[PDB]
Amino acid sequence: SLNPDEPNALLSYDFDRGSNYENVLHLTDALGALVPESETEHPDQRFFQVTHLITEYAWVQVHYELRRAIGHLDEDRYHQAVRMFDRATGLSEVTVQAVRLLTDHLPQHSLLMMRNALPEDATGLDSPGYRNLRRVARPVWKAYEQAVERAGLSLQDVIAQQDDGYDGPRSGGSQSLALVREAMLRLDGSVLGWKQHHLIMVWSQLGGQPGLRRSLATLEARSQLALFPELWRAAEDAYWLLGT
Amino acid sequence: SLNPDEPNALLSYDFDRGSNYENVLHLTDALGALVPESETEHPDQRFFQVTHLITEYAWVQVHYELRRAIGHLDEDRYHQAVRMFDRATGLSEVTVQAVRLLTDHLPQHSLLMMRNALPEDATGLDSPGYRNLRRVARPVWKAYEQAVERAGLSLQDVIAQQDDGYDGPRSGGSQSLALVREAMLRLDGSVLGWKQHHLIMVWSQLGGQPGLRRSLATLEARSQLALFPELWRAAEDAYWLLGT
Amino acid sequence: SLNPDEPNALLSYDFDRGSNYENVLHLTDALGALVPESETEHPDQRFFQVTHLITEYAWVQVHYELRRAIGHLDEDRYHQAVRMFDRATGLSEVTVQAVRLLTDHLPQHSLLMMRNALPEDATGLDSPGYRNLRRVARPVWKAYEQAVERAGLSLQDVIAQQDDGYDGPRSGGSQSLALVREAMLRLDGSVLGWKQHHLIMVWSQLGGQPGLRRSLATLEARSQLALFPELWRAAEDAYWLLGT
Amino acid sequence: SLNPDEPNALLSYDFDRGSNYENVLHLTDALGALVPESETEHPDQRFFQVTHLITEYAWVQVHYELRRAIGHLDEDRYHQAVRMFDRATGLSEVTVQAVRLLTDHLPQHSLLMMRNALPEDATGLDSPGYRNLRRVARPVWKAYEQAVERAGLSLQDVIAQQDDGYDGPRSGGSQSLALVREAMLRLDGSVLGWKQHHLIMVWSQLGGQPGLRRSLATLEARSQLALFPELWRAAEDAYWLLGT
Ligand code: HEM
Ligand code: HEM
Ligand code: HEM
Ligand code: HEM
Ligand SMILES: C[C@@H](c1c[nH]c2ccccc12)[C@H](N)C(=O)O
Ligand SMILES: C[C@@H](c1c[nH]c2ccccc12)[C@H](N)C(=O)O
Ligand SMILES: C[C@@H](c1c[nH]c2ccccc12)[C@H](N)C(=O)O
Ligand SMILES: C[C@@H](c1c[nH]c2ccccc12)[C@H](N)C(=O)O
């Protein structure tokens, strides 16, 4: 492979040129995964494939950075945990962009023709990025919870410390764990956003949009499972404890 | 008003300077709507206010452009309708950014303190942008539907024509109405996205995140009402007619 | 209930009508600034105005948050200053989205016709939002620099501590000042981004693209001034110190 | 099931295991390109690699869609070409998000340490994605220009018809070529955007910010070359023709 074409003018996609850019990145191995253009069953199949691969790359990186967050949290390196969660959120937002590409540009008619030939078994439930992100979420939450325990703080404390008008006592440690909580909440909101945009996409490709009233019922229910349910519970606590 | 301050160094927000930039835009009238800083009950109130105003400005512009789309559709100016829907989508994406600003940076504790003093009657159900966008959606859909009728096309036709591999007959008119449908679908997906991001925001401020299992039940149901339900019905039709 | 348009098919109206949602937001004042439809030179005039207004609301709010950041830095409330800079950054990203709206949807031919009917002397150099943002950048930088001095820290020390591999000394205060630094650099990068997208927009409307070899030469040179030039200087010193 | 990491607490593993979802996507091949954890110089190396890989997947897909656009333009399938350019634009926006990820989260100090352990001759000038995109821009522009000729149209005619106020002649083919033009200009603006954000990123890592008065001078001059310089020339001619 020096190219994924054979006929052309300047239309040839030249790659595998031995540059150290390609060597450092292992770009030829990555480009090797694309369905060769001699085996595409549809002009839109590549687009379908590439958006999945971009997502899976972002999700494996999210996993990696969450493992680092656990290390930082277990060693009280709270400022360094913050950066890991912020980076994970940025990567999650790429997966959102990627599924919205399908919503905006994948023709339902192409998808139905393609799907009418799939192994009728290819389900995103088997996605490694998704399964592993779900697994690592429990250790991640445990590490944050124990850090809050060791500091002698309650979740209501770190939540309240985000408000400049809140007058209770603070330390450098409690405000750092506040920043961590806020960054974890933003990551979780971004993953929930992915689930909601993936839903909108599915309604536009397989039907089932609920305003009118293919295992859509389980999908709609799974689409509201948070990464960190304890953060959302704490939000609900604050409403009941502080509201009027 | 030459300023929204009184004490300062270079910290003064100088405005109302008579420039023709300000005159053309009526910027002094717009800046006049901000709660004066002598009457703010909380440092986060301005942020709350400004994100609403940005949204309402985008929604009134969406309304304006949809009225233009109706004109173009009623006169068979399909290429010009496309641009109106594309512009409306871009504006809708601003409202999404704006509600995600609250999710990411509005402290729940500030909101609860602020809300603990609101007229306990200020509901987004009274939003002019939202109500008027809901009203105009029916005329908008009617105008598109009649245009498809006059051309002698079915919705399944315009949907199928988005796929390059589809072999049925096309005209310039049918592919133009295909582009219009696609742009309308993207607008509707963006408004559904707003409703979903507004939901995530509310779960993070008032609780009620459904994975754990304040009129949240009606909100969750209204959050799946589409602007153009007939487009989503047609997506469901295509699944049943073309799938295996 | 008022009305931004008069002779219509009734379902194509917009309304302004005294609810508490509108009262709390001063919404009727804000919508009052829109150019009346009885007075529009061109159908694209509303769009032109609204993207400016959205931008100006974002910039006035940026200023308000930078003032709060100055207050936090002067009192050594470093964690609280971080949140202010991050909020400013997200507001800045709304201005980027607003100017790209014009790049993507404002027809050059409507801009040229509108520029003829428009006061020849109206210029964005008179933006209150842009002008006050440049004025407030000086005290913001001073407050950060003073806070770093009081802590007895080196700006190069602050930069190095963002790296997990860095082995030198860390306190809680130095790592907090590190997070402030990074948040400040993200804000400045966002504003540079605005300047760059505004340039791309001007090239597509008034011509002047530099690769082809009306106050353009100043605009390009102005487009490279940072809000916090010292942070970019500090980035240059670190390269000579560690990358040669 | 394989594993991108070995000695762990079991819930912190990543897996690769033969489902049809993985088979259809060639996912195991694609994840194989990630640098093994046993071989990473620095914890920020994975992040560095993944943002490049995501970018390169996006660019190879852009190329594939531009090839399709050439095919559509050569056969006068103008509506179909529009969809290809819009898809390319959204893919380009993923590359922008990917490089801003480095601007916002890659520590300069890790980049300098990593740049030392890295082959001194590796350069983005050898990007297959970037290189093929520049090569394919020439036939893309030719196909568009030829299509406009065959229609007997003026590029200024095509520009004017984007305006709803324009009164001159319009056919279905001229307005289709107008939509193609606008989609092409949005793509080029997106790529200019990438170049500008890449510059901002380089300034924050290698120094070199131009407002402070290592192949920087070429990079800045390269950052202003468009993919379709004729469209920007055409924008300049329209200003002299109509804005003086
Ligand atoms: C970037 C593209 C996509 C990615 C990364 C992706 C990923 C996923 C993931 C992770 C799940 C498990 C979701 C959960 O448990 O909440 C899932 C399920 C599902 N996906 Fe997607 N998906 C993509 C595109 C699509 C498309 C284009 C369709 C159909 C047109 C689709 C249809 C479904 C359905 C019906 C389910 C649930 C039932 C089932 O597993 O078959 N997905 N997908
Ligand atoms: C940019 C900011 C916001 C905008 C433009 C906005 C707008 C709206 C709109 C249009 C509705 C009607 C929704 C529907 O029928 O589906 C609504 C309802 C609602 N909003 Fe939001 N909202 C904003 C922020 C908030 C915040 C910060 C909260 C609470 C923390 C909130 C709580 C609610 C609730 C509970 C409802 C439904 C029940 C009710 O009307 O009280 N909103 N809002
Ligand atoms: C959409 C909202 C817009 C905003 C908020 C805005 C704001 C600004 C600002 C703040 C400046 C000063 C730049 C600096 O000093 O670095 C400026 C200058 C300039 N703007 Fe924009 N602008 C907008 C749209 C436009 C449009 C549509 C044009 C169309 C030609 C334009 C053309 C120019 C030019 C040529 C300058 C350079 C100085 C001058 O000739 O007045 N701007 N604008
Ligand atoms: C994140 C993904 C990145 C991609 C996809 C990428 C791609 C590229 C491309 C395509 C060029 C050629 C530009 C042109 O010819 O106009 C280039 C040049 C360059 N890149 Fe980036 N780049 C990335 C990250 C970085 C980073 C982190 C640095 C850090 C210093 C960097 C530094 C440079 C420099 C200095 C040049 C100019 C020529 C040279 O010295 O090699 N790039 N890069
Ligand atoms: C689950 C979904 C699918 C989602 N992502 C996929 C990737 C490769 C193959 C198939 C898929 C599949 N098209 C479905 O309709 O269920
Ligand atoms: C409906 C929501 C509200 C939403 N947007 C608002 C604007 C101004 C005043 C109040 C609101 C309100 N805070 C609530 O909790 O119901
Ligand atoms: C500076 C620019 C302008 C930019 N923003 C504006 C707002 C209102 C009136 C004019 C403007 C103006 N159109 C120009 O061509 O110089
Ligand atoms: C050109 C740039 C580089 C940019 N992208 C890369 C990918 C792999 C290795 C190196 C690079 C490189 N770091 C440099 O400083 O020149």
Author numbering:
A (entry chain B), B (entry chain B), C (entry chain A), D (entry chain A): 4 to 216, 235 to 265
Show sentences the authors wrote.
pmcMarE is a bacterial enzyme that catalyzes a unique 2-oxindole production reaction through monooxygenation of (2S,3S)-β-methyl-l-tryptophan (β-Me-l-Trp). The amino acid sequence of MarE shares significant similarity with tryptophan 2,3-dioxygenase (TDO), a histidine-ligated heme-dependent enzyme that catalyzes the activation and insertion of molecular oxygen by a histidine-ligated heme into the indole ring of l-tryptophan (l-Trp), producing N-formylkynurenine (NFK). TDO and its closely related homolog, indoleamine 2,3-dioxygenase (IDO), catalyze stepwise O-atom transfers, completing dioxygenation through two sequential monooxygenation reactions. To elucidate its enzyme-substrate interaction mode, we present the first X-ray crystal structures of MarE in complex with its prime substrate, (2S,3S)-β-methyl-l-tryptophan and cyanide at 1.89 Å resolution as well as a truncated yet catalytically active version in complex with the substrate at 2.45 Å resolution. These structures establish MarE as a member of the heme-dependent aromatic oxygenase (HDAO) superfamily and reveal its evolutionary link to indoleamine 2,3-dioxygenase (IDO) and tryptophan 2,3-dioxygenase (TDO).
Unlike the successful crystallization of the full-length protein in the ternary complex, we resolved an ES crystal structure of truncated MarE Δ(270–284) at 2.45 Å resolution through co-crystallization with β-Me-l-Trp. Unlike the ternary crystal, the MarE Δ(270–284) crystal belongs to a body-centered tetragonal space group (I422) and contains two protomers in the asymmetric unit. The dimer-of-dimer structure was constructed through crystallographic symmetry operations, consistent with MarE's homotetrameric oligomeric state in solution. Each monomer structure is nearly identical to the ternary cyano complex, with an RMSD of 0.54 Å for 243 Cα atoms, though it features a longer disordered region spanning residues 217 to 234. In chain A, two substrate-binding modes were observed at the heme distal pocket. The other (conformation B) is a new orientation where the substrate's amino nitrogen points away from the heme center, while the methyl group points toward it (substrate with cyan carbons). Interestingly, chain B exclusively displays conformation B in the ES complex structure of truncated MarE Δ(270–284). In the binary complex structure, the SLGGR loop is disordered, consistent with the disordered region spanning residues 217 to 234. As a result of the disordered SLGGR loop in the binary complex, Asp124 of the DATG loop remains in a retracted position, no longer interacting with Arg235 of SLGGR.
